[PDB]
A paper describes a structure:
The longer K772 construct includes a full neck-linker and the first coiled coil domain CC1. The faster migration of K772 is consistent with this construct forming dimers in solution, as expected from the presence of a coiled coil domain. However, different from the MT-K743-ADP/Apo and MT-K748-ADP/Apo maps, the MT-K755-ADP/Apo and the MT-K772-ADP/Apo maps show a neck-linker associated density going sideways reaching the motor domain of an adjacent protofilament. Extra densities that could be associated with a partner motor domain in the dimeric K772 construct are not observed, suggesting that the partner head is not in a well-defined location. Because such density is not observed, the map is better fitted with a model in which the KIF14 dimer in the Apo and ADP states binds to the microtubule in a one-head-bound state. In this state, one head is bound to the microtubule with the nucleotide-binding pocket in the open configuration and the other is tethered and presumably in a semi-closed configuration similar to the microtubule-unbound KIF14-ADP crystal structure (K-ADP_4OZQ). The dimeric K772 construct in the Apo and ADP states also provide a high-resolution view of the one-head microtubule-bound intermediate occurring during kinesins translocation when one kinesin motor domain changes binding sites along the microtubule. In this intermediate, the bound motor domain is in the open configuration with an undocked neck-linker pointing to the side and the partner motor head is mobile and not visible in the cryo-EM maps. The conformation of the neck-linker in the K772 and K755 Apo/ADP structures suggests that the tethered head is positioned sideways and toward the microtubule plus end (the direction of movement) relative to the trailing position seen in the two-head microtubule-bound intermediate (step 2).
KIF14 is a microtubule-based motor protein with essential roles during cell division. As all kinesins, KIF14 possesses a highly conserved catalytic motor or head domain that contains nucleotide and microtubule binding sites, and where ATP hydrolysis is coupled to the generation of mechanical work. Here we report the near-atomic resolution structures of twenty KIF14-microtubule complexes corresponding to five distinct KIF14 constructs in four nucleotide conditions mimicking four key steps of the ATP hydrolysis cycle.
Author numbering:
A (entry chain B): 1 to 431
B (entry chain A): 1 to 441
C (entry chain K): 392 to 750
The structure:
């Protein structure tokens, strides 16, 4: 049977795990004791996708943590679901990076990679089979990029056929919550594009626009945003875990969405989302969802789609439905805004369905899209780069631990080339 | 006496079986578990007919079928659901990996480790079958396993067993709708591999039944099951000849002969005329003339193929219920009188017929309604070529720009296979473009 | 462009004459045709050039020296004019690519004529006012890793030392620690190549032994030093030129050839590389015909080596070997189908609405 692994690094990855496993436990019906309290005879039928076995009929995740500074992992252990994890799987060290990439890829990440593999191999060989690997990390940090990118490089050097998904984070246009987001995220985008089947590029500000304008929440915390990133990561795999009138997996998504191998930088979305005291005035039906999805106010990049085109999309549904309505709505959508989609691909979507939705809902949908609006995220990144490398601003830090300017130049060249690949298709493209 | 092995493949196959066997058990009056309380009411005879179901000394029964999907998310329902304790525990579900909506995994890397077991079980079923092993494959294009694994299985069976009846009730993409993006690449190669080894391969399109769902039986929110039952009634309208007594009985060895003029043009279409609702089951006669009229109309066809753009190479019919061959002849001659239809000169006969007294049977809480007779139709035309001719314009662009490709060869496929297949399909189009001319000299 | 892919054929053999393998390929000269013992279906392929080398006395014969003089003048021209040039070969066992590239000691192939005419034009023009300094490298690609062929291995297992590919902003792709040597006689490069072919790997597939599981690259750098200044001895520049040759594998259907384990990985990598190369060549002819368009350079490793040696003012070509054996037909067909997309006519439409020819 199929199995999946999860990796986490940096502060963001740990803090996202502390919400994601806290959600999946309520989906499959598990508690902070590692114990079962559900109702069905179904949630325990395919729980092995994520979780391992126990002694007292408890259950455990196959999760791994990486981060170098203990000052975050302690927040887990003094946390709600912070005593289910195997304490051996909380791999750590000391001597934090300093929001540096070189101090997380070369000095200490390159040191700690073996100790991390000492757990990775243990958990991977326990699986009767395998489907792929996850990651939940960010850029602009330290360990959340360097150590994790090194991990992905090694792991793909091992497993050329298994899948590696990286539900990462990329920095924002307007606010730069860290100064040197561009250099670190650029090195990551270099060491990711060739060493990944698919990465789910996600941005902060779209979540803020959602929680401020759409759900009409007043004052959210990071938890209330990772609370959406988790559901994004969860509706993907619902096909794999629970039955449905049309199944799916990670491979069908990555293969029916990554035509060219480099072009695998995706854009997510979730549906339904409404204010607490306003879902009275709607209907839980496919038309409402398909109208709410493709709008530019439910994505997670703040990157204008109407400024570009979509190569392809993917929509994983969850509930008792009627596939005819899905098909008719999708054809209508391709028919109306047809210019937004591509000429040289005739149909530009697949589907996936499950007959088992979350604990309190009747109908849901997760959106995935291979687009070209990811351009401006990257033209902007390269612009913020070439505004800095033009005078060697912060360079001596990244060099003093044993780098050279050549690697930076290589990263810039690869980013610009991927940008031009994306720009190949944005125009009319007619005759 | 005479039997028919039935394989179902992919989620399409498994769901279609989950409908079909639930039909077959109710037709013969059979419990889920495998007993015959209907026989306990009757007490003897051959009614638990050995055409499909083998029997034991203990009384339990079992159908002579299997199914494989390479995705245990599906069939583990059937290992545990309502119909669990019926089927043979051998359902080969080595679904360590999915078929990725690709034909490379279904035919080479994941095409191995099972196929040996499948042929072994086909042997373990055949040596007790004391008649034909007329094969039925309920597979689908687009879907993963039912393309590649099916292509392997049929070409292998061509070498193992050969001179038998091998049929494919395949499923074809709608020209606009899909649940996939690389559906043509997974649909075209199975044609290249079936064109030599399968003898006849019926076809459907999901969009056509989706259009049926509202025009006639007045529904607009259907599931897949509500189509699987139509498929099941089609297959019943075929098999009911071999199964039960009849006036004009037909064997599966007839369908392969009276509808396959040439070896390569063996790709017909299928319809079932009375598709009408319990409310609309009243308000109308359902006489034979109007039924057979619907058996040539464009709407109630199970495929988006306007036959008025093509011609009819042949048409077969299988009727049910209280039927009168003179009424049948009147309907046929009424249909041959129209200028709206153009049979070819080299098929003046056109029609083959077969009859069974036993009508169909209702299924609880479903869609259809009990009637006193019914009809099914099969037809080899020359209009379906256009549909194939659409896929080349849905193929050639992508293979030219080389989109959605590198995820194939990563599992062992060569690119030239595409082109060597492409022109083959092109040649097939020429055959459908060649015969449709009333030759003089 | 004038990339000008070309095709050759193997006259059968005395061994094949024993078996009397039925001729499948018919030729009208400029076009090429083919048959199939079903004798209903038919194909017809066009190319810029046709070397119908089967017959011995037929007009328009394809001689080895004629193969040289067909494609040699653009090489020396485009080099001495300062630019770089590559050559691609494609074909498999039974097509005898070795017979084409290398020939025999007595039957001269392609490489030896090239290097010898090079040395000829060198020693002819070797004034005091000029210096020609030429150096060599030879490596291979294997499961999408680079490996040096020229390395005199040390005491170890056969951990074929994997170098890496990196990028200068000025001249772009290259390798660190890439060994080089010097050329002053055809015999020296002959010995170097004779040893380099030994470490390149094959395996006894169902077909035969020497089915290569790698792609073999041969590179020569030439330094032209004539620059001399009127004020005094100052070389204001020293011209560089890159010459390249490469031999490749087939396409290796794993469908019929049910070989598993490690050979499958090799074949899959080889096929991916061949795919990317075909796409690159399509983009080339699309780009030298009036349409600026991206190139998928960075997909493979090999192509990433060549982004300057196969672009801009770089005129190269491809050669395709075959054999008309009945037991090769599919492979034969596949070979041609890899190349013909470089055809000039691929159904390009016509559009023109610009109308401001005024003033
Ligand atoms: C009466 C009612 O509608 O209860 C809802 C609810 O009020 C709303 C607001 C829920 C609620 O979600 C939010 O409003 C929200 C709050 C902060 C940040 C982001 C979202 C809800 O939390 C979400 C939750 O439904 C879920 O999403 C699943 O329970 C969720 N599991 C968890 O979030 C979870 C977290 C910690 C511990 C245990 C469970 C889930 C979703 C997808 C996939 C797997 C699990 C339920 C019933 C509700 C509340 C609780 C109010 C909605 O949640 C979603 C996106 O499905 C928001 O709109 C839906 C439905 C409702 O409108
Ligand atoms: N007409 C009809 N078509 C169906 C039905 N179920 C599935 N299909 C078609 O089958 C296709 C996918 O089939 P599958 O091969 O089972 O896909 P899967 O479940 O992922 O299994 P693999 O593709 O082999 O990995 C879909 O695109 C549908 O169009 C059905 O019940 N009726
Ligand atoms: N979206 C989101 N981002 C986070 C969260 N926690 C940390 N981050 C990101 O982490 C980055 C800060 O760098 P960080 O990863 O903490 O450095 P490091 O952990 O020492 O490697 C910022 O860009 C944040 O956006 C979170 O809960 N949500
Ligand atoms: Mg599947």
């Amino acid at each position: 049977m199929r199995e999946i692994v999860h990796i986490q690094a940096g502060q963001c990855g740990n803090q996202i795990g502390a919400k994601f496993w806290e959600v999946i436990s309520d989906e499959h019906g598990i508690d902070p004791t590692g114990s079962y309290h559900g109702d069905s005879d179904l949630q325990l039928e395919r729980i092995n996708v994520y979780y391992n076995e126990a002694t007292g009929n408890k259950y455990v995740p196959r999760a791994i943590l990486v981060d170098l500074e203990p000052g975050t992992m302690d927040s887990v252990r003094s946390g709600p679901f912070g005593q289910i994890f195997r304490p051996d799987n909380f791999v750590f060290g000391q001597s934090g990076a300093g929001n540096n990439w070189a101090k997380g890829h070369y000095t200490e990440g390159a040191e700690l990679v073996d100790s991390v593999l000492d757990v990775v191999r243990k958990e991977s060989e326990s699986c009767d089979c395998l489907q792929g690997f996850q990651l939940t990390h960010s850029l602009g940090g330290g360990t959340g990029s360097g150590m994790g990118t090194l991990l992905i490089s090694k792991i793909r050097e091992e497993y050329p056929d298994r899948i590696m998904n990286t539900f990462s984070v990329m920095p924002s246009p307007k606010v730069s919550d860290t100064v040197v987001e561009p250099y670190n995220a650029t090195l990551s985008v270099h060491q990711l594009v060739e060493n990944t089947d698919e990465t789910y590029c996600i941005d902060n500000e779209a979540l803020y626009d959602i929680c401020f304008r759409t759900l009409k929440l007043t004052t959210p915390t990071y938890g209330d945003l990772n609370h959406l990133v988790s559901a994004t990561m969860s509706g993907v795999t619902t096909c794999l875990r629970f039955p449905g009138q049309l199944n799916a997996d990670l491979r069908k998504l990555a293969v029916n969405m990554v035509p060219f191998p480099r072009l695998h930088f995706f854009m997510p979305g979730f549906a339904p989302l409404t204010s607490r005291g306003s879902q009275q005035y709607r209907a839980l039906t496919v038309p409402e969802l398909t109208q709410q999805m493709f709008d530019s106010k439910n994505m997670m990049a703040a990157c204008d789609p109407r400024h570009g085109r979509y190569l392809t999309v993917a929509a994983i549904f969850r509930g008792r439905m009627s596939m005819k309505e899905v098909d008719e709505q999708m054809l209508n959508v391709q028919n109306k805004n047809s210019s937004y989609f591509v000429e040289w691909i005739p149909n530009n979507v697949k589907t996936a369905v499950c007959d088992i939705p979350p604990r309190g809902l009747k109908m849901s949908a997760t959106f995935i899209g291979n687009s070209t609006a990811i351009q401006e995220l990257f033209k902007r990144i390269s612009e913020q780069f070439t505004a800095m490398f033009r005078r060697k601003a912060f360079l001596h830090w990244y060099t003093g631990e044993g780098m050279d300017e050549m690697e930076f130049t290589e990263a810039e060249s690869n980013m610009n080339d991927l940008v031009s690949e994306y720009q190949q298709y944005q125009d009319a493209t007619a005759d | 006496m005479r039997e028919c092995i039935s394989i179902h493949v992919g989620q399409a196959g498994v769901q279609i079986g989950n409908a079909c066997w639930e039909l077959y058990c109710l037709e013969h009056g059979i419990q889920p578990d495998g007993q015959m309380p209907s026989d306990k009411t009757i007490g003897g005879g051959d009614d638990s007919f050995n055409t499909f179901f083998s029997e034991t000394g203990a009384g339990k029964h079992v159908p002579r079928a299997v199914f494989v999907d390479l995705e245990p998310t599906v069939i583990d329902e059937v290992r545990t659901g309502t119909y669990r304790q019926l089927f043979h525990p051998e359902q080969l579900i080595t679904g360590k990996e999915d078929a990725a909506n690709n034909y490379a995994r279904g035919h080479y890397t994941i095409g191995k480790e099972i196929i040996d077991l499948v042929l072994d079980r086909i042997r373990k079923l055949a040596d007790q079958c004391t008649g034909l092993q007329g094969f039925l494959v309920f597979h689908s294009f687009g879907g993963g396993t039912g393309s590649g694994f099916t292509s392997l299985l049929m070409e292998r069976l061509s070498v193992d067993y050969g001179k038998k009846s091998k049929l494919e009730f395949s499923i074809y993409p709608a020209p606009q709708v899909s649940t996939a993006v690389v559906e043509p690449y997974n649909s075209i190669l199975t044609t290249h591999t079936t064109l030599e080894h399968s003898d006849c391969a019926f076809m459907v399109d999901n969009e056509a039944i989706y259009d049926i769902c509202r025009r006639n039986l007045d529904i607009e929110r259907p599931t897949y099951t509500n189509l699987n039952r139509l498929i099941s009634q089609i297959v019943s309208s075929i098999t009911a000849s071999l199964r039960f007594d009849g006036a004009l009985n037909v064997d599966l060895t007839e369908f392969q002969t009276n509808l396959v003029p040439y070896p390569r043009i063996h790709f017909p279409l299928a319809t079932y005329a009375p598709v009408i609702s319990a409310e609309k089951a009243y308000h109308e006669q359902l006489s034979v003339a109007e039924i057979t009229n619907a058996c040539f109309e464009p709407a109630n066809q199970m495929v988006k193929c306007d036959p008025r753009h093509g011609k009819y190479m042949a048409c077969c019919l299988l009727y049910r219920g209280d039927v009168v061959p003179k009424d049948v002849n009147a309907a046929i001659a009424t249909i041959k009188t129209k200028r709206s239809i153009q049979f070819v000169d080299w098929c003046p006969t056109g029609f083959k017929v077969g009859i069974n007294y036993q009508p169909p049977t209702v299924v609880p809480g479903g869609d259809l309604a009990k009637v006193q007779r019914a009809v099914c139709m099969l037809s080899n035309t020359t209009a379906i070529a256009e549909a194939w001719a659409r896929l080349d314009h849905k193929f050639d662009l992508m293979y030219a720009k080389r989109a959605f490709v590198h995820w194939y060869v990563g599992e062992g496929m060569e690119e030239g296979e595409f082109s060597e297949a492409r022109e083959d399909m092109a040649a097939l189009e020429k055959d459908y473009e060649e015969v449709g001319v009333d030759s003089v000299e | 462009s004038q990339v000008t892919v070309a095709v050759r054929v193997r006259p059968f053999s005395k061994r094949e004459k024993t078996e009397k393998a039925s001729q499948v390929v018919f030729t009208n000269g400029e076009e090429i045709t083919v048959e199939h013992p079903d004798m209903k279906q038919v194909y017809s392929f066009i190319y810029d050039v046709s070397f119908w080398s089967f017959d011995e006395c037929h007009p328009g014969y394809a001689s080895q020296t004629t193969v040289y003089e067909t494609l040699a003048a653009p090489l020396l021209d485009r080099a001495f004019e300062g630019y770089n040039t590559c050559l691609f070969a494609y074909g498999q066992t039974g097509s005898g690519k070795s017979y084409t590239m290398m020939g025999l000691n007595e039957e001269p192939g392609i490489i030896p004529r090239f290097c010898e005419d090079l040395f000829a034009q060198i020693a002819k023009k070797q004034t005091s006012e000029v210096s020609y300094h030429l150096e060599m490298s030879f490596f291979e690609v294997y499961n999408e890793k680079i490996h040096d062929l020229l390395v005199c291995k040390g005491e170890n297992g056969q951990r074929k030392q994997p170098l890496r590919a990196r990028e200068h902003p000025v001249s772009g792709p290259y390798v660190e620690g890439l060994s080089m040597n010097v050329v002053s006689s055809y015999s020296d490069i002959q010995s170097w190549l004779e040893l380099g072919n030994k470490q390149r790997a094959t395996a006894a597939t169902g077909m035969n032994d020497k089915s290569s599981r790698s792609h073999s690259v041969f590179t020569l750098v030439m330094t032209q030093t004539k620059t001399e200044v009127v004020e005094g001895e100052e070389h204001d520049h020293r011209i560089t030129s890159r010459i390249n040759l490469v031999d490749l594998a087939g396409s290796e259907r794993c469908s019929t050839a049910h070989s598993s384990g490690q050979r499958l990985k090799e074949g899959v990598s080889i096929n991916k590389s061949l795919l990317t190369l075909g796409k690159v060549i399509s983009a080339l002819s699309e780009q030298a015909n009036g349409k600026r368009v991206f190139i998928p350079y960075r997909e493979s490793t090999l192509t990433w080596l060549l982004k300057e040696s196969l672009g801009g003012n770089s005129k190269t070509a491809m050669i395709a070997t075959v054999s008309p054996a009945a037991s090769n037909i599919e492979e034969t067909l596949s070979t041609l189908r890899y190349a013909t997309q470089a055809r000039l006519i691929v159904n390009i439409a016509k559009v023109n609405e610009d109308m401001n020819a005024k003033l």
